[PDB]
Design an enzyme around this catalytic site. Structure first.
Site, PDB file in Angstrom:
ATOM      1  N   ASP A 168      38.665  47.782  36.073  1.00 20.41           N
ATOM      2  CA  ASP A 168      38.281  47.746  34.675  1.00 20.41           C
ATOM      3  C   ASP A 168      38.929  48.959  34.013  1.00 20.41           C
ATOM      4  O   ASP A 168      38.638  50.083  34.394  1.00 20.41           O
ATOM      5  CB  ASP A 168      36.761  47.743  34.565  1.00 20.41           C
ATOM      6  CG  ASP A 168      36.195  47.778  33.152  1.00 20.41           C
ATOM      7  OD1 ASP A 168      36.968  48.031  32.197  1.00 20.41           O
ATOM      8  OD2 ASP A 168      34.983  47.557  33.021  1.00 20.41           O
ATOM      9  N   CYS A 314      43.544  25.552  21.938  1.00 17.24           N
ATOM     10  CA  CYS A 314      44.910  25.329  21.488  1.00 17.24           C
ATOM     11  C   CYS A 314      44.954  24.663  20.115  1.00 17.24           C
ATOM     12  O   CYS A 314      45.747  25.066  19.259  1.00 17.24           O
ATOM     13  CB  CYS A 314      45.700  24.479  22.477  1.00 17.24           C
ATOM     14  SG  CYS A 314      45.996  25.348  24.034  1.00 17.24           S
TER      15      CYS A 314
HETATM   16  N1  LIG Z   1      38.396  45.833  30.740  1.00 21.71           N
HETATM   17  C1  LIG Z   1      39.502  45.275  31.242  1.00 21.71           C
HETATM   18  N2  LIG Z   1      40.162  45.919  32.234  1.00 21.71           N
HETATM   19  C2  LIG Z   1      41.290  45.387  32.726  1.00 21.71           C
HETATM   20  N3  LIG Z   1      41.887  44.247  32.385  1.00 21.71           N
HETATM   21  C3  LIG Z   1      41.201  43.613  31.417  1.00 21.71           C
HETATM   22  C4  LIG Z   1      40.039  44.053  30.799  1.00 21.71           C
HETATM   23  N4  LIG Z   1      39.625  43.137  29.839  1.00 21.71           N
HETATM   24  C5  LIG Z   1      40.533  42.190  29.887  1.00 21.71           C
HETATM   25  N5  LIG Z   1      41.495  42.402  30.848  1.00 21.71           N
HETATM   26  C6  LIG Z   1      42.683  41.599  31.129  1.00 21.71           C
HETATM   27  O1  LIG Z   1      43.485  41.630  29.968  1.00 21.71           O
HETATM   28  C7  LIG Z   1      44.317  40.448  29.938  1.00 21.71           C
HETATM   29  C8  LIG Z   1      44.181  39.802  28.575  1.00 21.71           C
HETATM   30  S1  LIG Z   1      45.149  38.298  28.283  1.00 21.71           S
HETATM   31  C9  LIG Z   1      46.867  38.883  28.169  1.00 21.71           C
HETATM   32  C10 LIG Z   1      47.544  38.871  29.531  1.00 21.71           C
HETATM   33  C11 LIG Z   1      49.000  39.355  29.503  1.00 21.71           C
HETATM   34  N6  LIG Z   1      49.127  40.688  28.837  1.00 21.71           N
HETATM   35  C12 LIG Z   1      49.882  38.315  28.794  1.00 21.71           C
HETATM   36  O2  LIG Z   1      50.501  38.702  27.786  1.00 21.71           O
HETATM   37  O3  LIG Z   1      49.944  37.148  29.288  1.00 21.71           O
HETATM   38  C13 LIG Z   1      43.898  39.619  31.162  1.00 21.71           C
HETATM   39  O4  LIG Z   1      44.712  40.046  32.257  1.00 21.71           O
HETATM   40  C14 LIG Z   1      42.473  40.120  31.429  1.00 21.71           C
HETATM   41  O5  LIG Z   1      42.099  39.926  32.780  1.00 21.71           O
END
Ligand SMILES: Nc1ncnc2c1ncn2[C@@H]1O[C@H](CSCC[C@H](N)C(=O)O)[C@@H](O)[C@H]1O
Ligand SMILES: COc1cc2c(cc1OC)[C@@H]1Cc3ccc(OC)c(OC)c3C[N@+]1(C)CC2
Ligand SMILES: COc1cc2c(cc1OC)[C@@H]1Cc3ccc(OC)c(OC)c3C[N@+]1(C)CC2
Ligand SMILES: Nc1ncnc2c1ncn2[C@@H]1O[C@H](CSCC[C@H](N)C(=O)O)[C@@H](O)[C@H]1O
Lengths: 339, 339
Positions: A168, A314
Site C-alpha cells: 500500500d 465502459c
Molecule cells: N494505496 C494503493 N497502493 C498501491 N497501489 C494502489 C493503491 N490504490 C490503488 N492502487 C493501484 O493503482 C492502480 C490504479 S489503475 C491504473 C493502473 C496503471 N497505472 C495503468 O495505467 O494501467 C492499480 O494498480 C491499483 O492496484
C-alpha cells in the site's frame, strides 16, 4: 417515477438497450456539469478553492482472472486512457502510443531508476524496461495478482531490469530514491493527496522528476458519487469515497513539496475511444468471458453481474469522456521537480 | 484605411466623440480575445504554458503634481481597482472598501510588521497604520514624490508607525523580514517574476503571509501591446514591455519559493466602475486640472497631451474591464506562505 432498484433490475437483466442506457447516463453527467459550472469566475474560484481546502482537511479479495482481463482489454491490459492517432488506431497501438507519450513527457532516458506507482498490469513498466535496457524499473502495486502477472511477463520478455514492490503506497516506508516517478491514473484513488505528494518528494532527489496523469474535468473538481437519488450509475460503478475527479488545475494547489515544470491535458475523446474499444472487445469475447469467470464466481448470475458492471463502466465512461467532443472530462498531466 | 497617425491626430484634437472612441477600443480588445482563446483545453494549456515558460527565460523624471492626482482620483489617490458594493458607492467609499478587503484577505492583525511593495500614494499603508496602531507599516516605492506625499499624510494624520523605503524593489537588498507583504497591482510591472517572488520570500519568515493582487484575464496571459498595426491604443497607453497581464492562474506556476494558501478573483465591473469614476471626476475638474498642469508642462498643448493620455486610459480601461459584464479582464488575488 421509477426507483433505483427498478432501473438496476432492468440493467442487470439486460433489458435496457444501449441507446437508452447511453441516454440515461449522459443525462446524469449533464446534471454534474450543471452542479459544477458557476456563473462568474469569482464564484467558480470560490467553489474550486472550497473543494481544494476540503481535500487538505482529509487525513477486497476477489480479483479478475488474467485470462478475463486479456479478453476485455488491450495486449498489455492498460487500465488508463490510451492515445489514438488515427480513426483506425487499434487499442494495442493506442496503448503503445500512450506509453511513448508518457516517456516523452516524463523525460525518460536510458540509465535512470524509474518507479511506477500503482503500476496495474505493468504495461508501462514493461515498455520502459524493454526500450531502455540500462534503466532499472520498479512497479509498485497493492495487488499480489498484479505483481505476479508483471513478474511472469518480464520473464517471458527476457527483461532482467524489472522489480515489483507489493505495498500500500500510503503505508510504504523506504529511503530509496528514484530519478523518475510516474503515477498514471492512481492519484484519483488517494484519500490524502497532500501527504501523498509529500511522500513522493521524499523518494526524489534534486535531479528527479515526477509525472502524474489523472482523469479530470477541465473546470471543476468533484468526488465521483451520486448528486441525487436519481443517480443509479455513480455508486454502481464505484463505492462512495473511492474516486476523486480533480479539475485540470487542482494539483497546482499541491506544491508544498514539489514544484510544477509543465502541464498538459489530453482531450477526452482519447479516453472515450479507449473505453469504446474495451466494450467492443468484451462484447466480441462475451461467451469466452462468461466461461473464464464461471469457476471463480460460482454462478452464471454472479458472472453476469461482474460483466454488467464492467460493460456499464465502459458505456458510462464513453458518455462522460465524449461529452462536448471531449471538452468536459479529459486527462490532465503534470511534470514536477522536488522543492 | 486610416493610419495610426490619423486616428492619433483626431484623438489629440478631441475630435473623436466618446461613443466612437469606446467602440474603437472595444474592437481592439475583441481582437485580443480572439488571439487568446483556443479551441480546446489542450490547446489553451499549450498556449498558456508557452507564455509561462517565456516569462521564466526573461532575466522618467516628470511626475504629475499632487494637486492634479487629487483632482482626478479618489481621496487617498488609489491607483488600482476599487470595490463597489452599491450603485451609489462613491470612489472614496470604494477605495476604503478595497483597503478593507485586502486587510481581510491578507489576514492583517494588530501588532504585525507590514510591507507594501509599490505603495503608490500610500492609501493602503495609511489605512493599515490608522486602523492597527500597533502595526509598523513600511511602504516601498521608487518615486521620491510618492515617498514625500506619504510622509506628509502620515504627519497630518498623526500616524507614528509609518516608514517609506525609497528603492527599486528589483535592486533593494535587506535582511529585514515582515509578517505581511502586500503587492497591489505592482507585479504587472515586474520584468522577472520568478526572481521577484524569490526576493519576497527572503523577506518572509515561516509565520509571514504574502498577498498579491494583479489585473488579469480569466483564461490567458498577454503582454500589454499592439497585436497589429491597427492597434493605436495599447502603445499609446503604455510603452512596450511595461505591463504584463497574467492569467488568473499564472502565479500558480510561480511557487518555487512560496506556496499558495488561497486564490480569488474580483469581477471586472469593479475596475470598470473605478476608471469610470476617475474619468468623470477628471472631466468635472478639467479646467482646474489644466491650470494645475500648465506651470510644470510649459504649454497648453503638452497639458492637453497629458490629459488626453489619462482620459483615454480610463475610457479604454472601461471597455476592457467591463467586457462581457466583467467576465474577461478582472482582478486576481492570491495568498501565499513561504516554502
Ligand atoms: N494505496 C494503493 N497502493 C498501491 N497501489 C494502489 C493503491 N490504490 C490503488 N492502487 C493501484 O493503482 C492502480 C490504479 S489503475 C491504473 C493502473 C496503471 N497505472 C495503468 O495505467 O494501467 C492499480 O494498480 C491499483 O492496484
Ligand atoms: C469515472 O470513471 C473513471 C474512473 C477511473 C478510471 C476511468 C474512468 O472512466 C473511464 C481510471 C481508468 C480505468 C480503466 C479501466 C478500469 O476498469 C476495470 C479501471 O478500473 C480499475 C480504471 C480506473 N482508473 C484508473 C481510476 C478511476
Ligand atoms: C491595462 O490597463 C491597466 C494597466 C494597469 C493598471 C490598470 C489598467 O486599466 C485600468 C493598474 C491600475 C492603474 C490605475 C491608475 C493609473 O493611472 C494613472 C495607473 O497608472 C499608474 C494604474 C497602473 N496599474 C497599477 C498597473 C497597470
Ligand atoms: N521596480 C519598482 N520598484 C519599486 N516600486 C515600483 C517599481 N515599479 C513600479 N513601482 C511602483 O509600483 C506602484 C504601481 S501602481 C499601484 C500603487 C498602489 N499599490 C495602489 O494600489 O494604488 C507605483 O507606486 C510605482 O511607483
Amino acid at each position: 417515477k421509477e426507483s433505483i432498484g427498478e432501473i438496476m433490475g432492468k440493467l442487470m437483466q439486460g433489458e435496457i438497450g444501449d441507446e437508452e442506457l447511453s441516454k440515461r447516463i449522459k443525462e446524469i453527467f449533464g446534471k454534474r456539469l450543471q452542479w459544477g459550472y458557476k456563473p462568474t469566475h469569482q464564484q467558480q474560484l470560490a467553489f474550486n478553492l472550497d473543494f481544494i481546502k476540503s481535500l487538505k482537511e482529509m487525513d477486497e479479495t476477489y480479483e479478475l482472472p488474467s485470462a478475463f482481463l486479456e479478453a476485455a482489454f488491450g495486449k498489455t491490459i492498460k487500465q488508463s486512457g490510451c492515445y489514438f492517432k488515427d480513426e483506425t488506431t487499434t487499442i494495442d497501438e493506442a496503448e503503445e502510443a500512450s506509453h511513448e507519450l508518457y516517456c516523452e513527457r516524463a523525460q525518460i532516458k536510458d540509465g535512470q531508476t524509474v518507479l511506477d506507482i500503482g503500476c496495474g498490469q505493468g504495461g508501462l513498466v514493461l515498455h520502459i524496461a524493454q526500450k531502455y535496457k540500462n534503466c532499472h524499473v520498479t512497479g509498485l502495486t497493492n495487488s499480489k495478482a498484479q505483481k505476479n502477472y508483471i513478474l511472469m511477463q518480464a520473464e517471458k520478455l527476457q527483461l532482467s531490469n524489472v522489480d515489483v514492490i507489493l505495498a500500500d503506497v500510503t503505508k510504504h516506508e523506504s529511503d530509496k530514491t528514484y530519478d523518475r516517478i510516474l503515477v498514471i491514473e492512481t492519484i484519483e484513488h488517494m484519500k490524502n493527496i497532500q501527504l501523498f505528494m509529500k511522500k513522493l518528494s521524499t523518494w526524489m532527489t534534486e535531479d528527479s522528476l515526477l509525472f502524474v496523469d489523472h482523469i479530470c474535468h477541465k473546470t471543476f473538481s468533484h468526488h465521483f458519487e451520486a448528486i441525487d437519488e436519481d443517480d443509479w450509475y455513480s455508486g454502481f460503478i464505484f463505492p462512495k469515497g473511492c474516486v476523486t475527479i480533480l479539475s485540470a488545475s487542482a494539483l497546482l494547489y499541491f506544491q508544498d513539496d514539489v514544484t510544477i515544470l509543465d502541464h498538459w491535458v489530453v482531450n477526452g475523446m482519447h479516453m472515450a475511444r479507449s473505453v469504446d474499444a474495451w466494450r467492443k472487445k468484451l462484447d466480441k469475447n462475451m461467451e469466452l468471458a462468461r466461461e473464464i469467470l464461471l469457476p471463480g464466481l460460482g454462478s452464471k448470475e454472479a458472472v453476469n453481474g461482474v460483466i454488467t458492471h464492467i460493460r456499464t463502466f465502459c458505456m458510462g465512461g464513453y458518455e462522460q469522456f465524449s461529452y462536448n467532443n471531449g471538452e468536459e472530462w479529459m486527462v490532465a498531466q503534470m511534470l514536477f521537480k522536488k522543492k
